[PDB]
Paper text:
The β-barrel assembly machinery (BAM) complex is a conserved, multiprotein machine that mediates the folding and membrane insertion of newly synthesized β-barrel outer membrane (OM) proteins. Cryogenic electron microscopy (cryo-EM) structures of the BAM complexes from the gut commensal B. thetaiotaomicron and the oral pathogen Porphyromonas gingivalis are similar and reveal a 7-protein, ~325-kDa complex with most of its mass on the extracellular side. Remarkably, besides BamA and BamD subunits, Bacteroidetal BAM contains a 14-stranded integral OMP that is intimately associated with BamA. The remaining four components, named BamH–K, are all SLPs and form an extracellular dome-like structure over BamA that may provide additional functionality to enable the folding and assembly of the many β-barrel–SLP complexes that are a hallmark of the Bacteroidota.
To obtain more information on the relationship of the co-purified proteins with BtBamA, we collected single-particle cryo-EM data on a sample in DDM purified from ~10 l of B. thetaiotaomicron grown in rich medium. Maps to ~3.3 Å resolution were obtained that allowed confident manual docking of AF2 models and subsequent refinement. All the abundant (that is, visible as a clear band in sodium dodecyl sulfate-polyacrylamide gel electrophoresis (SDS-PAGE) after size exclusion chromatography) co-purified proteins except Bt0502 are present in the cryo-EM volumes, each with one copy to generate a large complex of ~325 kDa, which we term BtBAM. In striking difference to the BAM from Pseudomonadota, most of the BtBAM complex is extracellular owing to the four newly discovered SLPs. Further classification and refinement revealed the presence of two particle classes in the dataset. Class 1 lacks density for the periplasmic components but has good density for all extracellular proteins, whereas class 2 has modest resolution for BamA POTRA domains 4 and 5 and for part of BamD, but with poorly resolved extracellular areas. Given that models derived from buildable areas in both maps are very similar with only small (maximum ~1 Å for Cα atoms) rigid body movements of the extracellular domain, we present only one, the ‘hybrid’ structural model. The highly conserved N-terminus of BamH is wedged between two strands of the BamG barrel and interacts with the conserved BamG N-terminus, and the tri-acylated BamH lipid anchor is positioned at the BamAG interface. Together, BamG–K form a striking, half dome-shaped structure in the extracellular space, with its apex almost exactly above the lateral opening of BamA. A total of 17 glycosylation sites were observed in the cryo-EM density.
Numbering used by the authors:
A (entry chain G): 386 to 537
B (entry chain G): 18 to 70
C (entry chain I): 28 to 196
D (entry chain A): 590 to 681, 697 to 884
E (entry chain F): 23 to 428
F (entry chain H): 34 to 95, 98 to 141
G (entry chain J): 27 to 214
């Protein structure tokens, strides 16, 4: 944060990552976090990071969607056409959210989430990477995947 | 009472057991700023005031 | 891997101690007398001074506060704790996989004796790499993440020091 | 909030003449009732349960001295049925406090001990003896789903601690905490316990009797009867002493070192102490 | 991990345990032709008819071991302990005897681990374990059809469970899912074993016996299953994607033959030979997944096992007043080609030398049978391990006057 | 054989404590926030506390080296604003082996 | 007592016979279209022993905005104890307590969860009286059985046995009667 201002705007404490297909439907239907289509994480002030740490279910969901589309189309499939349409198949958005918990089951503590909603108090943060990463590889994020290779 | 045998044994196990490996690979993700749109707020708090940044 | 930890850590300290006494150019090392045990020395290496000093001449005191970038590592170079994880602190960092480092506040009397001795002789904006014996580190059993009887090596950047936190934070 | 248990039994024994005249047959009939509400250490939580059981036991006993035997053996083979209501005789948490108005099982046991002297005896009658144990048990079920929640086995430690409850059978396994191999949700439906012992008496008298021993135990228990495996056991070892009092039973001290782990954890192994009272 | 730590046990049913009781374990395992009436012998059912009239024999046994394991310049050792037999035997008629007992058939035990680091900086660790075995509980009888000749059978329940796992773990990583596949094979069927013995009265004081034993080829009821676990941890069970398969398991035809010479009841010598037709067994599984199929076909594959053994025991001047005249002295040695096939070629070849005693209890007919055995397993190809294994063996034949009547 | 320090002083106003900086390189002690004008009547007889060091033997020059009365009250009005007409409260602290020697001026 | 407390059915039968109340089976309730007649004081025998009467099925002109999963529902009610015939809990206006402004100014609001099994609900906002008296956030399970049979702004009357009551009714084994003046979809 800039300026060392006394009463300035703070970094959003909790953010949600959701597939762009559900960008507005998620909040209009009052859904809770899906696990296979959206994730919640807190800011890690000791490193200045938002980290999601395992988004495997979302990747499998996207792969299954495209494979099912290819299976239904059969011999008349065209990969370029199907990526030229449905341009938000593989896009996700990061949203500041306000998350509230229930208070009961207190001694055997669990703290279930009961409402996720848009964060409307003033706050901001400046993230690394940007639109110049579309052309220049210095300004582009990396996604890290680890797997088991059976050698077949 | 020992429970380890160490690592002696691999090399005689069948191929589909001793060929399994782990791996790390990385892929590139682009990000950009986008406008908010017409969000559905629906909160019970009412906000009143002004400030300059 | 971690066999006979104490002897090899002490041997590392002795290697630095006699290198300063026999090598050309002191092997790059410099040293300070330790006020909690006169006659003992802490060994350190001078590094690239900063370019955004808050122009605070003088050296920190024993009972006042300090703002730093720091990283702590053991003899094999492995990570222990700190504000940064690469080979330099990160500010306006170009690489989008690493964030800009936070700054942390400490009290000179509230840290291990090695820090408490070396911080009283830096001037704002110095960068030093310091080599502290296990006698003046946490020592003996050690904290979480320390295998006991460990000689830590720290990389310190002094940004600012003050009498209270509220005029520093 | 409490748990209520009461019952009674009647039995009838008879000496045989077929193999030899040491064999004794025994038959017994028993009744028990369990009474509960909002209780939690049993799978059953709310209701009342009954059981009628008929037991046949065939035993042979040929030892010389009850308190410090020196020759002979003690064999027992027992089977304990309760009528099979799941079959046509009776025909027709999710529904587990249901269907156990009457509980169903058939329990089998084998139990053998074997005492030999190692230095002549008769002469210098203080002597020195080698003992030997071998116990097996099965709690079978007529129907795969209507397995009995009562009468299961509980194993690990002194064994005496289990008689704070009377709906289970407690089995000592020396060198492993107490009730360690059978925690909540893993009640024992089959078990095995083996083990040598070498014993030397310090004093044998009318009022008090003393002896010291070193052992070599090995035991285990399974939540599933189909995975019974008497060659996969939690081994042990140790030493101990026992006291017989003029106006009280046994009291004794046993130390044991558990060698193998339990359920992947070494927390229950290592050095352990057991404090035996009454009689095993 | 209660009988073995040899990593050869990742193949087949493990390694077959020899159900050799106290006298045979010191005498190299020459159990086919033996008629030593003071101790039990389940390996040939025709041997039961030698028991004295009023006696009941109850035998048991332990064993400790120290395996020196070597390969590729690495050296290590590992120490376990076992339970090898328990059996009862008694007489039903002047011409028939019966026995019931509990025996091992084969065991598995191995943990073999690993730790690594990729060039990209990721550290990872693997872990291949195994546990379980096959067991046998039997009831058998032997009868005299002629004054020289005895025959007998063992009918056995035959059950077990062998479990074998593969893991992939990433120490130091904050949050991740571990991969582990646990292939299990439960078995529950029956096994039949047949034998005969004949004794000849040479030279009025000696005697020579010959024995043979046979068990037919068999196909086993089983419950083979292919579990893959995902995401298990120190706090969570993960998820299990089970998979049930139509696998076929078998036991081969087995043949054995041997003899024992005996003199003045002071000396016995003998030798045995046996062959098991493992290479003529049709193991297999049917599935749509090639990885599983290849594993099955590479882990359950065999070669013909053969065994050659020789041994003796000597009991000097058993009526003189000195305890060392009452002690049975035993010796033996044996050779085996194990049934392991690794790659296309045969895996190992093993040798053994054995010695032991026969300590009797005074004023009783119980026997304590302390015995010891050195065995060396040599790998026949450069990538495989060599073993030097040592083992004591305690066992007690209780024996008491049981069926007496006035 | 160290000379670690935590030198402190008690409430001057009710619930008001003043912080002292400890310059071990230059061997002197002072409070950054100056005492109020009212205090010259209060520190006339006042109590020192938390003077913790590796071995508590400490003395002040008087001819003699008399031992400190750490548990007793003291007149500090002679030692105020000691930078000019310099009149520090100068005191000597001993190491536990009595080999290492130090003085501090307050 | 342990099993003797389950005699709540005697008290419910007393509470039924003390008033004009008729019982209809669900298989008749769902076949005369769907209505409990108010001139005859009909009640349906629902699942888990709940007796329920719809006084107004609600939203009669729109007919489409029924309740469903992830909704937040506002409840106004008055609660009567069956064993001793006493008004125990409420958040509605009545002249006998008209000047007690704290009790009735704010409603109770709960989230409604309706996945493939085990319907349940959690209070987001408890009313002042419930929040001080019972201090628990779990909705009486008997209420949730009524939602599939009504629409927005419905008026229903329920008798709730102990097995599906709130955290006090489940311990002291006490049935209750609720006059739910309104179920509403939550605005703002």
């Amino acid at each position: 944060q800039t300026g060392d201002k006394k009463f300035g705007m703070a970094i959003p404490s909790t953010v949600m990552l959701v597939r762009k297909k559900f960008q507005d439907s998620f909040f209009k239907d009052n859904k809770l976090s899906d696990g296979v289509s959206s994730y919640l994480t807190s800011h890690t002030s000791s490193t200045n990071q938002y980290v999601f740490s395992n988004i495997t279910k979302l990747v499998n969901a996207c792969i299954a969607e495209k494979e099912e589309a290819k299976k239904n189309a059969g011999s008349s499939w065209d990969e370029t056409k199907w990526l030229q349409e449905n341009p938000d198949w593989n896009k996700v958005v990061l949203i500041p959210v306000l998350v509230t918990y229930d208070s009961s089951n207190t001694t055997t503590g669990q703290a279930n989430i009961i409402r996720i909603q848009h964060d409307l108090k003033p706050g901001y943060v400046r993230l690394k990477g940007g639109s110049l990463g579309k052309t220049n590889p210095d300004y582009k994020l990396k996604l890290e995947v680890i797997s088991t290779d059976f050698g077949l | 009472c020992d429970d380890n045998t160490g690592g002696l044994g691999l090399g005689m196990f069948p191929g589909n057991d001793q060929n399994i490996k782990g791996k790390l690979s990385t892929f590139d993700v682009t990000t950009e700023s986008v406008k908010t749109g017409d969000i559905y707020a629906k909160t019970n708090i009412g906000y009143i005031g002004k400030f300059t940044d | 891997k971690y066999d006979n930890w104490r002897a090899r850590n002490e041997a590392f300290i002795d290697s630095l101690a006699n290198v300063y006494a026999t090598a050309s150019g002191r092997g790059g090392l410099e040293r300070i007398e330790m006020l909690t045990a006169p006659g003992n020395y802490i060994y350190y290496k001078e590094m690239e001074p900063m370019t955004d000093h808050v122009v605070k001449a003088g050296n920190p005191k024993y009972t006042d506060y300090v703002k730093v970038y720091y990283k702590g590592t053991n003899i094999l170079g492995e990570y222990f704790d700190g504000n940064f994880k690469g080979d330099n602190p990160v500010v306006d960092g170009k690489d989008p996989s690493e964030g800009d480092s936070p700054t942390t506040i400490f009290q000179v009397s509230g840290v291990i004796t090695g820090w408490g001795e070396v911080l009283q002789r830096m001037e704002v904006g110095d960068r030093w790499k310091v080599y502290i014996p296990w006698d003046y580190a946490y020592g003996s059993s050690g904290t979480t993440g320390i295998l006991g009887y460990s000689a830590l090596v720290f990389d310190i950047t002094l940004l600012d020091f003050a009498n209270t936190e509220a005029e520093l934070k | 909030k409490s748990i209520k248990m009461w019952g009674l039994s009647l039995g009838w024994g008879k000496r045989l003449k077929w193999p030899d005249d040491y064999f004794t047959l025994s038959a017994e009939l028993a009744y028990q009732r369990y009474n509960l509400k909002d209780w939690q250490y049993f799978p059953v939580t709310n209701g009342k349960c009954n059981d009628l059981s008929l037991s046949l036991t065939l035993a042979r006993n040929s030892i010389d001295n009850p308190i410090f035997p020196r020759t002979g053996s003690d064999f027992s083979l027992s089977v304990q049925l309760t009528p099979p209501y799941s079959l046509f005789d009776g025909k027709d948490q999710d529904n587990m406090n249901k269907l156990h108005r009457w509980v169903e099982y058939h329990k089998w046991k084998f139990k053998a001990k074997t005492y030999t002297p190692l230095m002549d005896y008769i002469a210098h009658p203080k002597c020195l003896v080698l003992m030997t144990r071998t116990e097996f048990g099965l709690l079978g079920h007529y129907n795969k789903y209507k397995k009995s929640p009562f009468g299961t086995f509980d194993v690990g430690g002194d064994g005496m601690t289990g008689y704070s409850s009377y709906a289970t059978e407690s089995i000592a396994l020396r060198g492993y905490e107490n009730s360690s191999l059978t925690p909540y949700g893993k009640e024992g439906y089959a078990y095995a316990r083996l083990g040598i012992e070498l014993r030397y008496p310090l004093m044998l008298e009318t009022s008090t009797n003393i002896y010291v021993l070193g052992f070599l135990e090995a035991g285990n228990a399974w939540h599933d009867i189909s995975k019974f495996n008497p060659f996969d056991l939690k081994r042990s070892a140790g030493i101990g002493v026992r006291i017989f009092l003029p106006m009280i039973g046994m009291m004794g001290i046993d130390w044991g070192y558990g060698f193998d782990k339990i359920n992947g954890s070494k927390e229950y192994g290592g050095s352990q102490f057991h404090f035996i009272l009454g009689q095993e | 991990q209660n009988n073995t730590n040899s990593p050869y046990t990742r193949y087949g049913y493990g390694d077959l345990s020899d159900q050799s009781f106290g006298n045979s374990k010191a005498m190299g395992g020459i159990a086919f032709g033996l008629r030593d009436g003071a101790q039990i012998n389940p390996t040939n059912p025709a041997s039961y008819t030698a028991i004295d009239s009023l006696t009941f024999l109850f035998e048991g046994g332990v064993s400790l071991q120290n395996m020196n394991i070597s390969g590729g310049g690495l050296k290590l050792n590992a120490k376990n302990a076992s339970f090898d037999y328990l059996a009862m035997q008694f007489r039903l008629a002047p011409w028939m005897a019966m026995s019931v007992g509990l025996l091992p058939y084969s065991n598995v035990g191995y943990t073999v681990s690993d730790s690594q680091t990729t060039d990209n900086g990721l550290a990872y660790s693997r872990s291949f374990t195994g546990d379980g075995g096959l067991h046998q509980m039997y009831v058998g009888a032997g009868v005299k059809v002629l004054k020289n000749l005895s025959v007998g059978v063992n009918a056995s329940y035959f059950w077990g469970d062998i479990t074998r796992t593969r893991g992939m773990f990433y120490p130091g990583t904050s949050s991740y899912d571990s991969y582990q596949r646990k292939m299990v094979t439960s078995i529950s069927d029956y096994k039949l074993d047949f034998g005969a013995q004949y004794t000849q009265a040479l030279n009025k004081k000696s005697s020579l016996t010959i024995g043979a034993v046979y068990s037919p080829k068999h196909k086993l009821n089983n419950d083979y299953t292919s579990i893959v676990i995902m995401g298990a941890s120190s706090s969570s069970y993960g998820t299990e994607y089970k998979d049930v398969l139509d696998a076929t398991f078998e036991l081969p035809n087995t043949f054995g033959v041997g003899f024992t010479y005996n003199y003045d009841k002071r000396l016995t010598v003998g030798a045995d030979y046996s062959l098991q037709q493992w290479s003529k067994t049709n193991f297999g599984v049917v599935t749509s997944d090639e990885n599983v199929r290849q594993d099955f076909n590479e882990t359950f594959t065999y070669c013909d096992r053969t065994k050659i053994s020789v041994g003796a025991e000597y009991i000097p001047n058993l009526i003189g007043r000195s305890y060392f005249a009452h002690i049975k002295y035993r010796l033996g040695a044996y050779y085996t080609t194990p049934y392991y096939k690794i790659d296309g070629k045969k895996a190992s070849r093993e040798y053994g030398v054995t010695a032991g005693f026969g300590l009797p209890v005074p004023r009783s007919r119980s026997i304590l049978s302390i015995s010891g055995q050195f065995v060396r397993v040599k790998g026949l190809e450069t990538n495989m391990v060599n073993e030097n294994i040592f083992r004591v063996s305690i066992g007690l034949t209780f024996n008491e006057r049981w069926f007496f009547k006035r | 054989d160290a000379t670690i320090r935590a030198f402190e002083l008690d409430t001057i106003g009710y619930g008001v404590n003043y912080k002292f900086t400890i310059d071990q390189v230059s061997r002197l002690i002072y409070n950054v926030d100056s005492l109020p004008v009212n205090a010259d009547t209060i520190i006339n007889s006042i109590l020192i506390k938390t003077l913790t060091t590796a071995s508590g033997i400490v003395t002040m020059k008087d001819d003699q080296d008399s031992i400190v009365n750490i548990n007793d009250s003291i007149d500090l009005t002679k030692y105020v604003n000691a930078t000019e007409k310099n009149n520090f409260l100068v005191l000597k602290v001993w190491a536990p082996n009595m080999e290492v020697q130090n003085e501090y001026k307050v | 007592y342990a099993e003797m407390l389950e005699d709540e059915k005697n008290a419910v039968n007393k509470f039924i016979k003390d008033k004009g109340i008729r019982i209809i089976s669900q298989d008749e309730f769902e076949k005369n279209d769907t209505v409990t007649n108010l001139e005859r004081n009909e009640y349906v025998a629902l699942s888990d022993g709940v007796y329920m009467q719809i006084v107004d099925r609600g939203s009669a002109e729109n007919k489409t905005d029924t309740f469903a999963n992830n909704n937040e529902i506002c409840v106004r009610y008055i609660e009567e104890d069956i064993m001793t015939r006493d008004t125990t809990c409420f958040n509605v206006f009545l002249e006998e307590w008209g000047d007690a402004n704290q009790l009735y100014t704010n409603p109770a609001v709960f989230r409604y969860v309706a996945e493939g099994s085990y319907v349940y609900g959690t209070f987001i906002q408890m009313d002042y009286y419930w929040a001080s008296y019972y201090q628990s956030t779990a909705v009486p399970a008997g209420w949730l059985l009524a939602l599939p049979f009504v629409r927005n702004y419905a008026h229903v009357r329920l008798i709730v046995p102990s097995k599906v009551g709130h955290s006090s009714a489940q311990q002291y084994v006490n049935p209750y009667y609720y006059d739910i003046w309104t179920f509403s979809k939550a605005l703002n």
